[PDB]
């Protein structure tokens, strides 16, 4: 008897801006983990143990910092080992945006 | 019939709803910002762009997995109406020295 | 005396974000003056001096922002001129957690 789904986006999003903060120089990482998250199939990300897990994970990102890619590794590979394959008008719509933003650099 | 700070308050409502779900995707966010900011001095404050702003926060609370589309309905909106005004010489300076000092952190 | 912290996190926060709207096709820009202020003194951020600091440069940042750069240049300086200077773990953890990352293309 739990969902915990959005404590858990909101304590994503806690974390991430954790990340996008302190891996500034290795922009590949942030959707990494934004990917890691998706992939992953919708129980787990909205179950408790996902709570304890993010919040066990924001404690420590918080207690130590200087550890970060620990964490970051550790919350990857625990989204790792939930998955699942994905996937009209939505799709297309995203496509045509961040062309337009990519084509104005 | 000044309708701006009502238009304010939906738009912010609106932009805060894609700071949560699109900041997957960190460079939506201050596009559409900006082509709010580059908008119209008047249109910005209308009953018109007040029905908009709302019947997109209508279907973007309504249906939010079409989300993208309303974001671009409302970046399009927002195209449509724009003026001008873009190079000062002291920003940049600062601005590449800077950058250029973000680099070398490295 | 006086000490000030809690509104100088929400006057930094502030610009920070005043930031990420406007130096969007630089996203190290605002990583970098996160870090500035982390790396900061532990009593200067919570000084009155640095409230002062951070209400001008927010309000020419709203007033004048063809020169946000000038603005964020500035807060940087005053913000490493003040600094601790102060992980093994980590090393293996950003390099394996990067080639994972790389591998994954």
Same mark, same amino acid.
């Given at each position: 008897?739990?969902?915990?789904? !959005? ?9 991430? @801006? ?41 404690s420590r ?6 550890? !970060?890619?620990?964490?970051?590794? @550790? ?13 009209? &008008? ?8 961040? &062309? &337009? ?5």
């Amino acid at each position: 008897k739990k969902c915990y789904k !959005l404590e858990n986006e909101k304590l994503f999003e806690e974390f991430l @801006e954790l990340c996008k903060m302190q891996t500034a120089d290795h922009p590949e990482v942030v959707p990494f983990l934004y990917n890691r998250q998706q992939r992953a199939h919708s129980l787990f990300l909205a179950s408790a143990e996902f709570c304890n897990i993010l919040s066990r994970v924001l404690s420590r990102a918080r207690s130590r910092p200087a550890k !970060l890619y620990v964490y970051i590794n @550790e919350l990857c590979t625990v989204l790792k080992a939930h998955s699942a394959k994905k996937k009209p &008008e939505n799709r297309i719509a995203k496509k045509m945006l961040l &062309e &337009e933003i990519k084509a104005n650099l």
